[PDB]
Amino acid sequence: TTRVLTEAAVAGKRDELRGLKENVIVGRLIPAGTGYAYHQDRMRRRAAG
Amino acid sequence: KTANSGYLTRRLVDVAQDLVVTEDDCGTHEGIMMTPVIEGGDVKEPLRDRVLGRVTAEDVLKPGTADILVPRNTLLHEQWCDLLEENSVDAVKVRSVVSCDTDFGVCAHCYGRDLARGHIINKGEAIGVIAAQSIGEPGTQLTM
Amino acid sequence: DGLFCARIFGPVKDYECLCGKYKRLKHRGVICEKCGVEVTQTKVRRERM
Amino acid sequence: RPLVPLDGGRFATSDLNDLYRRVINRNNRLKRLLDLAAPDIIVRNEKRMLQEAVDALLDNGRRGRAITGSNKRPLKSLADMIKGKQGRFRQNLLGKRVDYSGRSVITVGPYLRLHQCGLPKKMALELFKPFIYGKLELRGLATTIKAAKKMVEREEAVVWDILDEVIREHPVLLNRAPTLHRLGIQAFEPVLIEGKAIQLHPLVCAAYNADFDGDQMAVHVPLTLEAQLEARALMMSTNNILSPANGEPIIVPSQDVVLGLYYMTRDCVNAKGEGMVLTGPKEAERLYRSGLASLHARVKVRITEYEKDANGELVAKTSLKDTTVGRAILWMIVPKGLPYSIVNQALGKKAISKMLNTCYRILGLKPTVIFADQIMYTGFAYAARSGASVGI
Amino acid sequence: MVYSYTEKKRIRKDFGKRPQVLDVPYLLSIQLDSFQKFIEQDPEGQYGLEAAFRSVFPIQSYSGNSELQYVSYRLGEPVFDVQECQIRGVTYSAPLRVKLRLVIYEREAPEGTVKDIKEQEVYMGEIPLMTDNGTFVINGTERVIVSQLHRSPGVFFDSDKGKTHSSGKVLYNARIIPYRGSWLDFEFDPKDNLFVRIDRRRKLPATIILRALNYTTEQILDLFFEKVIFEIRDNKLQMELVPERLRGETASFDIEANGKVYVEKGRRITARHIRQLEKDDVKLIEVPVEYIAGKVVAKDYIDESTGELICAANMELSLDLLAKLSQSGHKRIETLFTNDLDHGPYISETLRVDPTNDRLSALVEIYRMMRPGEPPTREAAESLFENLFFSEDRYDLSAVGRMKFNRSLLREEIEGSGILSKDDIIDVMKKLIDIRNGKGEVDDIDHLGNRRIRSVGEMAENQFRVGLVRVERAVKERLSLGDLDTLMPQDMINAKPISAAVKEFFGSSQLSQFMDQNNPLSEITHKRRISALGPGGLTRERAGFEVRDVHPTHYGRVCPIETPEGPNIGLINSLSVYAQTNEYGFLETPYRKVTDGVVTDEIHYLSAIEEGNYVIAQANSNLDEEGHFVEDLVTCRSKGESSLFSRDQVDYMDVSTQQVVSVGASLIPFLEHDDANRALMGANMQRQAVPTLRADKPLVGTGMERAVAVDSGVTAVAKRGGVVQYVDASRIVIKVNEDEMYPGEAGIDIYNLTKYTRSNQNTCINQMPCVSLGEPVERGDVLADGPSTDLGELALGQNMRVAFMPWNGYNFEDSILVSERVVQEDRFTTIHIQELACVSRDTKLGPEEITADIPNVGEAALSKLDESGIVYIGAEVTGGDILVGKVTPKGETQLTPEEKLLRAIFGEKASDVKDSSLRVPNGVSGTVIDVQVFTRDGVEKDKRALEIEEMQLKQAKKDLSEELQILEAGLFSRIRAVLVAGGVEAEKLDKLPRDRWLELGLTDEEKQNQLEQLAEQYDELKHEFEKKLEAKRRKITQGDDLAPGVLKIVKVYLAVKRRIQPGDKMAGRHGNKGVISKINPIEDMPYDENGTPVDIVLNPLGVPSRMNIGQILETHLGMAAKGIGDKINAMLKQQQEVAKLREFIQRAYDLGADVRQKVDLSTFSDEEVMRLAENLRKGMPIATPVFDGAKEAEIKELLKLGDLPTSGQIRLYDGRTGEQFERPVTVGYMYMLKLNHLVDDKMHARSTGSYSLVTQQPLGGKAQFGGQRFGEMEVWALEAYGAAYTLQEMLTVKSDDVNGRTKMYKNIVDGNHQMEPGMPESFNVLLKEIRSLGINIELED
RNA sequence: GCCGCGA
DNA sequence: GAATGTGCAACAGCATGATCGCGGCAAGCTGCGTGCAAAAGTCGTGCCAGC
Ligand SMILES: [Mg+2]
Ligand SMILES: [Zn+2]
Ligand SMILES: [Zn+2]
């Protein structure tokens, strides 16, 4: 974790919570199975502004 | 050896978790040639076991030329496998996940039917975790 | 002004301020003259840095 | 970063507080030495000490040795205490301990269906306490929450009745400790039992890698409508029959059941009944139960098979087949649409799995579930009847 | 004479077939011997506190002319016995007193003294003592200390396995390991360079330390190499002849002997040419010049003309250098061997590596090397070199280290200085050179001759020595400013460091763990346990596969079967039955000497090193009447192997078949028929069984049950018993026989049995007598049997009728089907004792006071409390019943009018005092057994405490009156005899008391001598009786000097009976285990023709896959034994004549095939025969030893004797349908054990409880109301299933959503089943931690 | 945190 | 024919090593001091209001 955090800190990057582990850590619905339907509707809202 | 198996399972799950089926059919013509596995002079894996539950990337031509057995982009099941083994087919062109050509996921056609149910895999199935668990469930019984 | 101090980090016991000058829910966000303790839900001990 | 309590009003400072207070002490003494126009050597040494203390606080054990507390153990820093094993294993990232959770030793229940599991009623009434409170408040037994709580503590008979009402069709998911594949956690319909051990259906044990020699399993309540649907439609034992690794049926009879069928479908050159011609499998059962015929006797039976060549239809054909009494008896539990040659063998743990696979592939999911349950029932029954034993 | 009084009660039918030579040892000798040699005095300084004192004392100030001269030492008598010490909860220990004297010497007069103050003994430290069983009662606990197995200090050569640089170059290294001090390592680089790793620092060439011993480079080369001399006179340049040296070489030119050609240029190199050259006596011969070019000069020749010389050692020579040395007159030049056939280029290469050639340079270099700090000033380097190695105190090899050193280097002497000398390093370096040269070989690290075992005594010795050094450190300082007025108490005794170190070792250490208390077997196996871990041992992760394997040297020393399974497999071991410890600390095993072809009875104990040379015979080798081997060819072990030798080549013989097997695995009958892993499982599981209501002997055993039961100290053994006088359920009083007696005061033996007492594992400890009344008891007899012991025989399970058959799948997998009669007859029913403690102590506002009266509690809860506020003894508590009423005062000094009227309407306190009363925790029920109220001295004694002291006094006087009654009876008999001797009044003399006024005076001699002496004896006996009784009275009622804060302590013990139930765990002793699945009624279990149903139904499928054939053999043999018992019972039913019953018993006992059992009923009393036949009416308790047990033929003939089927299988009928099963079922009697894994302690369920302030997640585990952790794998499975909503509810709304939890609870109580998720607190905590670093992390919108 | 134990 | 960089091999340091449960101990207790203004609190003392 030490190595990844330093490289992430200097680069100023973002996660965007696209995979399964990120949503599990945050606690939202994972983009798979039953949560796939919810995540798809949210994407269109962001695309449509 | 259980620690060495669990570490491998952890690594596989981590590396494969970001993979779910997002497309129904990418329509790519790429594929993999698939033949029965033979080491030397004995048969270790017949064609039916390897090609079952997979979508053909190209038509399989019987020894009689210009004869179409099963068309391109179809799901192979027990009936199709029996019909295929009835003839003298040896190699089949079958699309695979490594050539899905889709972005951020795998097509539902490049990935064959899910091994849990007879139907084709549906969109939203986390195939990476299933694959990692399938590979890493043994290893506790592998004789190192 | 130590590691565990009440002037910052929020109050220690619910809506009560140090020295007992302002210890009620009626008072909200009031700085006591004797001590810089403000009246809050005492959960801000988890948030103030 | 709470500080630990102990006997008396004394409070022992923790590791993180130790590092922070060391840093503050060094910084305060260094800043006070600045204003005194001290010689460069002492200020230099104090700046070095402050830098070392800060480095130890942020990541202990780097650029030198790790400072230790009262005991001879490293004083774990911010980096070491991120989350458990320096990552997010323990308190985040799928490390959360959850309530509405039980845990107990598992035993075997051969009377259970494939979708059912035995739950102790003492384990229940605890995992389902909020539901019992809600039902008590709904039916007017208790107007206030305190009355419902008190009457649940007292455990009256109507409390047990309401617990049975709540349990009726609320699935609960059981898992074993080393969850290797996805089949290691499965949903079941609970049936209340007067005990303390979970009764688990034998056919799923091979999926759980669970044996009844001291194994324990944990119980989680999907207390949400979406969670209940997911448990019923995605997690149920009747739902996952074929393993998602090779497609072979993971729920297959083993141990006694395999011995039960194998002993049933065997032939002997001479037994009670030779060349008898019987009209149906019912008569084979009648003769076996009456003691006038043996399980291994070779007889000819008039048997009707069903076949699926007609498009979406079944055709029935009747013929006289030479078989044994045991195979004829076993034929009474197989569903329609399967050939008789599926039971005219010895059924050695490979033909029965093949027959289950063919039943799934040809008929469906409910017929093969019922067929597996009937197979396990008859295997246990005839293994008990045979009285197999191992001697010197 | 053949059998003692315990054996005639019940005789085990041994099967034997092989005579025993040496009886099983005490089975607990290691711990007792270690502590005895640690404690007992010693005229010399071998070991113990005396040796530690010799090591430390005497001490003196630095030139202060003041010294502390000590003499002897003494251990005080403990103030409490083991029983009272265990009851009270304090440490069983003894004070230590030491005598030492001041000697102050004259400053003006050298070597003269002016003061010698011989002060008396002083007290320092308190040494815990070991009980008679092998345990250290500390803090009211048992705390057995495990013996450690570690590396013996000395020299160890290793090969690294030859895979480090992947070039195939095997690197040989040497390790110097002391008992205490710095290590040393000598390593070989891939370039063949000596390197020295001292104290695990950076690699350093050995030349610096070689020169640091005042060794010059030329001297080093002369010592470490063989030098040759080349003579160049008159340009001849002759060469010396050393025929043994030149083995592989190429003749660069013609080689002539005395002017005659001997070996041509490039001629034959075979040994024939060398032998021919050696046979011919030839002087020095000339050689070509080019040959000497590659040579390297050894010495440094000096030019006689000028001071300039070629001192460049370890260097070659030039052509001009030849002329230079010829001009200087160098006729002879000394060059080193320069030969590489078996020797190699070493030492010189390292000397070329580093140029330091001075002792000062080497010292300063090593000073800068080990310590990168301040450079030295010619003094720090010398002091550090003295302190690191060759130091009297800083560095010290043990005696075992010295002996290992001498043996490894082939030195005649064994004893020597405990420090390493100059030649020592030279010797080890030479040996390390030789091992790479080819001579010698690398040793095995895991050899049991290279592994030492240190016991409790040695560790306590080391701790006490450390404490003594710490004390002396400041004792020296105190003497500097000490005047003549100072005494030893004021001479800085410092008992506190000694006591602190000793207590820290004994109480809180890695190798001092809680003793297992399930059966005596667990205690026995824990006391003789061998752990590879510890302070000086190896960490679990530092261990490899080789350390956890069975070395071929583990034969008679370490059990190969019994060891823990999961994490600690191979790292923990059990001593074999006959294994003992050598004087130096290595494991030895006994063997029988073999002279000529006859095996004698004389016994030698052989260690690992010794037994590898002799050829050792086998225990299963048949013998003749004279002892000669029956076969001319015998299987044997010669050197770590197994072969077949002639009868004349056998050197030693195995004593017994049990020698390889430890105690735990010795109780598994038919062990040789079981798989090794399943045998390991059974041995492990035997130690988890709990004692039941009634002990039941194993119908089939191994004969080691008696030894285990007696040697564990769990029973009561008559020390010098005679005939039993009085038997009670709690006391045994024995009148000792007159044949052996202590002169004066006579005496009797009193044993106070320990009744129901809580163990370490909350089990019960109970003792019941075996003797009835007037029974003649010999020395070593068994009086009372402890928990899980029957008639002095180990019995930790119950015999159960078992049928091997599948039953409707209720025995599926490893499940067990149990009939209802097992539950009905209270079999497998156990008593568990739990201790509850409540303490009263002072606080801010006053004393926490204990009363029955408690504010705001109804009269319902006070029904079971006495007038002092404690439960009535025997009251059945359940749930949260009140145990002791304790009230804690609260603070208020401002009586507001509301409080005033509150105190007016209610009591004076007005319930101001809060209650903190001991309530039974939920889920705990049972009867109250005992209360142990403890009070502080000075405070008023409790009302129940008065009854406790009254009971103690009554018991003390009751148990003390017996000897006084006997003594006054003897005195009265003597007085009566005296009065009959003269002036006898017959019964009238007995009518009047006081001997009828001492029968007046009668004769003058009788009045002056007899009567006066009798009266004096009476008076002094009465006075001594009163004195001792008053002393005991005062001792019992003494105010306890309790802890400061604590004022009063009360303890409550609860007893509950745990009956068998489905989920419970039951197992045999062959590794077969399971959980019961169903308790079947009597009518539903299978029954035979006679109608008796079976008790346990087991699945046959577990046998063929686990290879537990011992299961089937034991079931068959137990069936045979129970058949014999049934025959005996049936014969007893009809009350037939004793002669025919004796005949049947005799016929049954003599059955076998040449069995070494000579039990005969002809010499057996008729009443004794009746009693024996009544004792074994249940079944004949036979005993089959481990590796020589009953054969199938013997079992079948035993079955034939008892009128039972030979095959061991009977026809079984279904209990429900009445239909016979098609195949016969093997019905037998098997010894089943109820393990300590019960569902009453493994059933947990939580809906909503307490959480942690950090991460806001629920707590963990039972006894804390925690939730089951949802680890990473189950979340992976949830993701694989696709159940995202279940995962979300399991991640947020169940664990860490502070408001989500409450919203979910409210919705469910309402009945909505709505999620309403949120943000887990764990991720917010993680964000705060990351922001607390220099890293900024935030959530975007 | 050590120590022992269950799958 | 001597000179100058690129490839390269040994080497030292970092990171990792299955999951879920159960029972017992032993600790872990942390840092002044100073003399004075400046303030606040307290105690011995006298006061009025209720019975
Ligand atoms: Mg198991
Ligand atoms: Zn695709
Ligand atoms: Zn304030």
Residue numbers in the entry:
A (entry chain D): 1328 to 1376
B (entry chain D): 789 to 932
C (entry chain D): 54 to 102
D (entry chain D): 250 to 641
E (entry chain C): 1 to 1341
Q: What does the literature reporting this entry say, word for word?
A:
Transcription initiation in bacteria involves the recruitment of RNAP by sigma factors (σ) to promoter regions located upstream from the transcription start site (TSS, position +1). In approximately 60% of bacteria, a major variant σ factor, σ54, forms a class of its own, lacking structural and sequence similarity to σ70. In σ54-mediated transcription initiation, σ54 recruits RNAP to genes responsible for regulating a variety of stress responses, including nutrient depletion, membrane stress, antibiotic exposure, and biofilm formation. In this study, we used single-particle cryo-electron microscopy (cryoEM) to determine the structures of initial transcribing complexes of increasing RNA lengths from 5 nt to 9 nt, which allow us to propose a mechanism of RNAP promoter escape in the σ54 system.
However, at 7 nt RNA, the RII-finger adapts a different conformation, to accommodate for the growing DNA–RNA hybrid and prevent steric clashes. The tip of the RII-finger is coiled backward by 9.5 Å, as measured from the Cα atoms of the tip of the RII-finger (Middle). In RPitc-7nt, the folded back RII tip is stabilized by interactions between Y112 of RII and V253 of β′, P110 with the DNA–RNA bases (Right). In addition, P110 and Y112, observed in 5 to 7nt complexes, were also not resolved, indicating that these interactions are no longer stably maintained. These results suggest that the folded-back conformation of the RII-finger observed in 7 nt complex is stabilized by specific hydrophobic interactions and therefore likely represents a kinetic barrier during initial transcription. Taken together, data presented here suggest that RNA extension to 7 nt causes the folding back of the RII-finger, which is stabilized by specific interactions between RNA, DNA, and RII-finger. In RPitc-6nt and RPitc-7nt, the template strand (at −5 and −6 positions) is scrunched around the RII-finger and σ54 ELH, while the nontemplate strand scrunches around the ELH, resulting in poorly defined density. From 7 nt, ELH and upstream DNA become more flexible, indicating a global conformational change occurring within the transcription complex. In σ54, we observe RII-finger folding back when RNA length reaches 7 nt to accommodate the increasing DNA–RNA hybrid.
